[PDB]
Symmetry: C3
Subunit: 110 residues, 3 copies
């Protein structure tokens, strides 16, 4: 949403001074917790999925990526092991591949 985004920036005209918006822009950047909305919109636009349904996937990816990093998994057949037997094979292998390529760099981010 970039059209109704500028319709939100206009609310800055309800401010009291140029000092409050000066401290409001500084707090809008460093607070990276607001980056989730950009992640949701880019997920809904790339997968043609609902906002509520995009939240379920992102939590799943977060949960699994954190998991393979926590246990420090370098084994391919170990990654494949936690996938259920009735899981889409090509997607299972695609994920497994991505897990292996980033399991090193991800663990450093802790």
């Amino acid at each position: 949403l970039t059209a109704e985004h500028f319709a939100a920036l206009q609310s800055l005209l309800k401010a009291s001074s140029k000092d409050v918006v000066r401290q409001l822009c500084q707090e809008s950047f460093s607070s990276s917790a607001l980056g989730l909305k950009k992640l949701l919109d880019v997920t809904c636009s790339s997968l043609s999925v609902t906002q509520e349904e995009a939240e379920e996937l992102l939590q799943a990816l977060h949960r699994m990526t954190r998991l393979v990093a926590f246990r420090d998994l370098s084994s391919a057949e170990a990654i494949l092991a936690l996938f259920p037997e009735n899981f889409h094979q090509n997607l299972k292998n695609l994920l497994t591949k991505i897990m292996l390529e980033h399991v090193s760099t991800w663990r450093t981010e802790a």
Copy 2:
């Protein structure tokens, strides 16, 4: 900062916990949670601007996207940054925001 009465009322929920270890975990996780330090920013925005809590989010989500695009493209120009704003946008507001982001594109 300080602790409000609502905060102490919220803390008492820990008496519902099954063990003292859960209480210990929740404390550690709450301190380390960077995302939690935004409920105050959400409240400040919603109070000093007299908007909805939802409307407060929409502004912060939009402001974050804007201040991110300033560093993502490293716009050093004071005019090309105002090009992002549409023609039907408040003149004095699009002149103020581009005057701050241009001064905060370095440490970004």
Copy 3:
């Protein structure tokens, strides 16, 4: 904690992708997300205490402001931390919390002095 059935069902939406690049891009940004780590924290809080999302959110915001306040003001004594709680506050919880934060105050200060 392992993945649930609902979790694997959610993963299958990745098949709706237009390229393998957006899938790996999704994996990277889902991992390095503080917001996603918080919603996981909310879920177990709601689970353990048998509370709602709102009630759990309040507690975590409460615990966040208090634990940070302890580290910021450097309250390295039980008497100083006990001074924060009102008189009508539950005594046993008052003692448990002031014990927990008297242990981590030193490790919390250092953690904040970094970032």
